[PDB]
Amino acid sequence: LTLNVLTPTQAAQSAKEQLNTFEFEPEKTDVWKDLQDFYYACTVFGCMLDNI
Amino acid sequence: MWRSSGVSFTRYASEMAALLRQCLKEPYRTQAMQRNQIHLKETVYQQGQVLTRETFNDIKKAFEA
Amino acid sequence: AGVASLSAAIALMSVGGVAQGIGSLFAALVSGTARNPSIKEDLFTYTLIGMGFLEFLGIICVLMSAVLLYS
Amino acid sequence: AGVASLSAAIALMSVGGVAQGIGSLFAALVSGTARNPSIKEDLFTYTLIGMGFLEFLGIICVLMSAVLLYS
Amino acid sequence: AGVASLSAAIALMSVGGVAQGIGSLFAALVSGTARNPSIKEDLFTYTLIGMGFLEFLGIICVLMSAVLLYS
Amino acid sequence: AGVASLSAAIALMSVGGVAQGIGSLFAALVSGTARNPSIKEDLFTYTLIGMGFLEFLGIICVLMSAVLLYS
Amino acid sequence: AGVASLSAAIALMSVGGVAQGIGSLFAALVSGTARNPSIKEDLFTYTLIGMGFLEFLGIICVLMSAVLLYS
Amino acid sequence: AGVASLSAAIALMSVGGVAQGIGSLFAALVSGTARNPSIKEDLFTYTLIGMGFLEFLGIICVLMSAVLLYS
Amino acid sequence: AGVASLSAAIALMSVGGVAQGIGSLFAALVSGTARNPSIKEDLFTYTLIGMGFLEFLGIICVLMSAVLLYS
Amino acid sequence: AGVASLSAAIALMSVGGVAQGIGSLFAALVSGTARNPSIKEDLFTYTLIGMGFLEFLGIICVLMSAVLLYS
Amino acid sequence: AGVASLSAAIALMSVGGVAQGIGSLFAALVSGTARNPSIKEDLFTYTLIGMGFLEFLGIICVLMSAVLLYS
Amino acid sequence: AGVASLSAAIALMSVGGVAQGIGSLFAALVSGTARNPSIKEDLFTYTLIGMGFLEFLGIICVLMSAVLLYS
Amino acid sequence: FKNQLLLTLSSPSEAIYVRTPVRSVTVPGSEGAMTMTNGHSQTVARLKAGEIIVRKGETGDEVERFFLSDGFVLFKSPEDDSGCCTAEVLGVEVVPVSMLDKESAATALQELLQQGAGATDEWTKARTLLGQELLSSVIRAAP
């Protein structure tokens, strides 16, 4: 498989209207940078487990 | 504290989970620090022509270097 | 005609707080609808109950003003 | 009864603060319902409890208005 | 001598609170639009209902002013 | 004389400042309950402590509104 | 003959509320713009509408004052 | 001399502000205990510390009111 | 005409609401520059528009004051 | 004849704003302690600084009230 | 020369009304520095600009106080 | 024991607003400290800069109060 | 299925719950603690530290405590056909409170304060402060 992964340039180029249904307890601009690193980490984790 | 200190949330979470594991009871702490050792070998490249190779066995030095 | 109109205008001073409360309440309504549209109709109701206090007090106020305009 | 009428008029400035407190309460209720609708009734209960106090204050000042308008 | 004018001016003072309420209304409107544009069209409706109360009270105020500047 | 009634109507102006305090406290109760219902009956207790002050600070002034009315 | 000037000043002593409302308006505009720039055209589109009421109220807050200065 | 009543009543207006402060403080407690219900003690400490000063302020206001009353 | 001198002061009292509004506006501006700095060119612009209103209102609050100090 | 009492009661009225400021300060303290309970000495120190400033202002106004009463 | 002093004292209200707004501005500066320490400049410029605006209003009212005190 | 005392007392009404501004300042300092302690020496600095206006303004008002008490 | 709360509390090394139906779940959000139940709105929140407290539908009164270091919570609305509302508590290290210790906790606090006394780097100061926070939370949460 090949996973097209989101990046900060691609996040800044989108207004993230799709996540407006979600209530972010910190503001979206303050929690996005901490959410994206978790997203990166989780992506690598499952991919490498499947590969193993 | 981290976007200001130039630190990632993953680094902060890992370095704090390390302390939480240090605050464990010995029977479970043994299995925790067992399952959370580190062994990596980074190898840096620049159009071929390896610039450096370095090993890592600690989380702090792995994130620092 | 001093005391009549004086008392009327003075009693008509407490409606600014009523307007402020109405504004705060409807602002909370707007925020809640922004955060959870699925219960929009369940908020409007409560806001009307708020009016059922607020406006009612305002009504009393205005009536008392008129009563002191023709006491 | 001029000074009495003026006193009764001046008595009715606290209605603004009563209305502002009512708006604050209903705003908090609306926000809490936008957050967790499943705690509606409990919240409503607490709201009404506070409203009782506010209502009491309102009635009190209205009564004093009447007193200073007749006695 | 300036009874009617003074009473009209004292009555006209609640326009400040009215404008504050309208500002809070439209602040909540723009905030909810920034937080969820997809329901913008809904929010404005409620905002207009808010005006439908606020401006209405303001109108009553001005009518009383027009009543008291001419007795 | 009748002038004392003015003093009474001034003494009832602390009411409507007490109302904002009650409103803020019960709104905080409502918000903290919507966020964390698990600890409801604690926050109620804290409100009973706050009203342990406010319910006095109101009626005290109302008593002054009587004492500087009849004297 | 300064009672007319006093009435005009009192009627002019409500622009502070209009100004506070306008400040809240533009504050919410700037906040929602920093939160979501792409939707600026709507936050402004509503902002002007709010001004379309607030400034009108302020205009009254001047006009009646001027009238009370002469009539 | 009933006039000395007026000053005392005027002094009582400060108590309203005091009540407002008390309310805000207790709201800050009732929120904090919900944000962090583990402690519930170090917040009550600072609450009592602040309420000491606020009660002192209210008490000196009452004393000055009684002083200007009797004298 | 000393009341002229009073009237001007009253016409200046609205500045207490004006400056507050301006402060709130610029506060929001700073918050925006702390959240999305890369669009200062927008926020400052909007702030200037707001001042283009607020300034004008304040100027009125001066002008009428001086007029009531001379006429 | 009793103008010094009136002046004292009119000068005392800043206690409302003083208490509002103190309440806001201690509310910020309680919230910051509920959030970061490991940081209390610095917050308490800054709260003590603010309380010192506010009590200085309060004692200033009380001293001026006593001066105007017993000049 | 008695009305001038009262005119100045009444004109001094905007100083206290202006201190609020400067407080909010510098609070916003503090919060922005807490949320983004990487940007100290470009927040102090806007903070100083808003301070300058509110200082201009303060200078206006103080100038008019000094004027009316001797004219 | 005349109008000078009344004017010097009315001048003191700004201390409430100044105290509210100082409270907002130090509450923002406390919040910023609880959020990011690592910039304490910055926030305190800015707070002092703010006091460098607010405190000074209060002193101004106090001085003008004495100027109206011994004009 | 049912109008319960489908919790899944998961760490990388162990999934404690997968589709567990519960009534209420308390979590220490970054702003403050909060309790999620069925009907709660869609939301995302970052956690800082403390004791998650789970309460099953069969339990009602009985609870289950779990200390979390850091992570996220994801509350997702209920599908129209499922009839049940879901919640996912992801934690980088999720321990129970039974397995915690206050002595090694205070020892680590002392060693952290020793290392951070030479406060030069921002990350070092921040790590010292956050360690103080988390270790105080552990001490207050342990039995």
Short mmCIF file of N, CA and C in Angstrom, two decimals, chain F residues 31-53:
data_model
loop_
_atom_site.label_atom_id
_atom_site.label_comp_id
_atom_site.label_asym_id
_atom_site.label_seq_id
_atom_site.Cartn_x
_atom_site.Cartn_y
_atom_site.Cartn_z
N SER F 31 -22.18 25.71 34.56
CA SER F 31 -21.13 25.33 33.62
C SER F 31 -20.30 24.17 34.17
N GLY F 32 -19.90 24.26 35.44
CA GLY F 32 -19.14 23.18 36.03
C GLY F 32 -19.93 21.89 36.14
N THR F 33 -21.25 21.99 36.24
CA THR F 33 -22.08 20.79 36.26
C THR F 33 -22.19 20.18 34.87
N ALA F 34 -22.38 21.02 33.85
CA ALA F 34 -22.44 20.49 32.49
C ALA F 34 -21.11 19.86 32.10
N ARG F 35 -20.00 20.40 32.60
CA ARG F 35 -18.70 19.82 32.29
C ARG F 35 -18.44 18.54 33.08
N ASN F 36 -18.77 18.54 34.37
CA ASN F 36 -18.44 17.44 35.27
C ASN F 36 -19.62 17.20 36.21
N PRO F 37 -20.66 16.52 35.73
CA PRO F 37 -21.80 16.21 36.61
C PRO F 37 -21.42 15.33 37.78
N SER F 38 -20.32 14.57 37.67
CA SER F 38 -19.96 13.59 38.68
C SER F 38 -19.84 14.22 40.07
N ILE F 39 -19.55 15.51 40.14
CA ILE F 39 -19.29 16.18 41.41
C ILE F 39 -20.36 17.23 41.71
N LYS F 40 -21.55 17.06 41.13
CA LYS F 40 -22.65 18.01 41.26
C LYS F 40 -22.84 18.51 42.69
N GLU F 41 -23.15 17.59 43.61
CA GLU F 41 -23.53 17.97 44.97
C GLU F 41 -22.42 18.68 45.74
N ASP F 42 -21.19 18.68 45.24
CA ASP F 42 -20.16 19.50 45.87
C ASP F 42 -20.37 20.96 45.48
N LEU F 43 -20.53 21.21 44.18
CA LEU F 43 -20.63 22.59 43.72
C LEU F 43 -21.84 23.26 44.34
N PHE F 44 -22.95 22.53 44.43
CA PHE F 44 -24.13 23.05 45.12
C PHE F 44 -23.76 23.53 46.51
N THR F 45 -23.00 22.71 47.25
CA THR F 45 -22.58 23.10 48.59
C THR F 45 -21.80 24.40 48.56
N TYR F 46 -20.89 24.53 47.59
CA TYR F 46 -20.10 25.75 47.51
C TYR F 46 -21.00 26.95 47.24
N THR F 47 -22.03 26.75 46.41
CA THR F 47 -22.98 27.83 46.17
C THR F 47 -23.75 28.17 47.44
N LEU F 48 -24.10 27.16 48.24
CA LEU F 48 -24.75 27.43 49.52
C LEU F 48 -23.84 28.21 50.45
N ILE F 49 -22.53 28.07 50.27
CA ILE F 49 -21.60 28.89 51.05
C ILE F 49 -21.57 30.31 50.52
N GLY F 50 -21.58 30.47 49.20
CA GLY F 50 -21.54 31.81 48.64
C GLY F 50 -22.79 32.59 49.01
N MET F 51 -23.95 31.96 48.80
CA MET F 51 -25.20 32.56 49.27
C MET F 51 -25.23 32.73 50.78
N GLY F 52 -24.37 32.02 51.53
CA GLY F 52 -24.25 32.28 52.95
C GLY F 52 -23.80 33.69 53.24
N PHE F 53 -23.18 34.33 52.25
CA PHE F 53 -22.77 35.72 52.31
C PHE F 53 -23.80 36.58 51.60
#
